Design a protein around this ligand. Structure first.
Ligand SMILES: Cc1cc2nc3c(=O)[nH]c(=O)nc-3n(C[C@H](O)[C@H](O)[C@H](O)COP(=O)(O)OP(=O)(O)OC[C@H]3O[C@@H](n4cnc5c(N)ncnc54)[C@H](O)[C@@H]3O)c2cc1C
Length: 295
């Protein structure tokens, strides 16, 4: 039922780039691009919260062909134009430095993708992943804890839940639960999909809450830069209260490192009711209600 490995790296789908648009506004840190690919002429289907592989061209330092890199799908199953013809990615150019040795090093696949031109052919594999799936239940609650490109699966959920065209195309999923995105990025210009996220919150103030942790613009109560873990601490009791609902799912996505602080905050909240968060969490994970994809 869930589409998986319709294309594999030995015989990838050759998609065509339709558009490659910047998500980091002036004054932001780094480069994150929204890249849409044409899937017509193949049968790649996918659902929300899945990933695809991109095989970049070229060889590594050892002369070996480059392997795929996985990217969380950033579009719903219908694609951004709700036509079932495309797939989108949210790709950060990886960069870091020296010495070490450099200075700046640019990641192979992410640079390729971030600079890719419309009309270019791309090797796509997948889809993959069954750990970040959105429940069919329209009354589920969905907590979304995202940093940077970790917004990607969250966009697939929120678009499916809240886009007019999605609602029109998905008679079986008219979302009436509560969704809460806590989104950590370093600056306001770095708030990926800011305008649309804020449009959703304005249109659905009872069904979507949007909370930001903007490290360069906000301080936590300890005077440190504000990170997602700080907003989770700040709202730990509320989040815990929501988590206790049998229908609540939580999704965490982003670069590795945010889980520890999130657990500490929820651990303290749950301990107040004599619950050991780490055990309760094990049970949530087993039930498929605790979804993590960090990289
Ligand atoms: C399930 C999944 C979903 C993902 N979703 C997304 C997504 O939606 N958007 C996105 O942009 N990426 C996503 N990623 C990451 C993506 O797959 C690539 O790993 C990333 O784009 C960098 O790949 P690259 O080919 O550009 O870098 P590569 O050329 O592969 O270089 C990566 C190497 O950089 C080295 N390195 C050294 N120092 C550092 C440092 N300080 N910081 C980082 N690396 C360092 C490490 O050796 C690392 O292996 C996801 C990964 C997974 C597994």
């Amino acid at each position: 039922d869930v589409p998986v490995n319709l294309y594999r790296p030995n015989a990838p789908f050759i998609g065509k780039v339709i558009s490659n648009e910047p998500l980091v506004k002036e004054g932001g840190i780094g480069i994150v691009q929204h890249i849409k690919f044409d899937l017509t002429g193949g049968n790649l289907k996918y659902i929300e919260g899945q990933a695809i592989g991109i095989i970049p061209p070229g060889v590594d330092k050892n002369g070996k062909p480059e392997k795929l890199r996985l990217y969380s799908i950033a579009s719903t199953r219908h694609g951004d134009d709700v036509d079932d013809k495309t797939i989108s990615l949210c790709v950060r150019q990886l960069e870091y430095k020296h010495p070490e040795s450099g200075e700046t090093v640019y990641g192979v696949c992410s640079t390729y993708l971030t600079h890719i031109e419309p009309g270019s052919e791309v090797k796509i594999t997948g889809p993959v992943g069954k750990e970040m799936l959105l429940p069919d239940d329209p009354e589920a609650n969905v907590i979304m804890l995202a940093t940077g490109t970790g917004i990607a699966p969250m966009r697939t959920y929120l678009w499916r839940m809240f886009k007019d065209a999605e609602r029109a195309a998905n008679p079986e999923y008219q979302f009436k639960g509560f969704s809460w995105l806590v989104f950590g990025v370093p600056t306001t210009p770095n708030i990926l999909y800011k305008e649309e996220l804020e449009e959703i919150q304005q249109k659905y103030p009872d069904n979507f809450r949007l909370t930001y942790a903007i490290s360069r613009e906000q301080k936590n109560p300890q005077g440190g830069r504000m990170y997602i873990q700080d907003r989770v601490a700040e709202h730990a009791d509320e989040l815990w209260q929501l988590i206790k609902n049998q229908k609540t799912h939580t999704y965490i996505c982003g670069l590795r490192g945010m889980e520890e602080g999130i657990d500490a905050a929820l651990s303290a909240a749950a301990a107040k009711e004599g619950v050991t968060w780490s055990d309760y969490q094990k049970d949530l994970k087993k039930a498929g209600r605790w979804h993590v994809e960090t990289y």
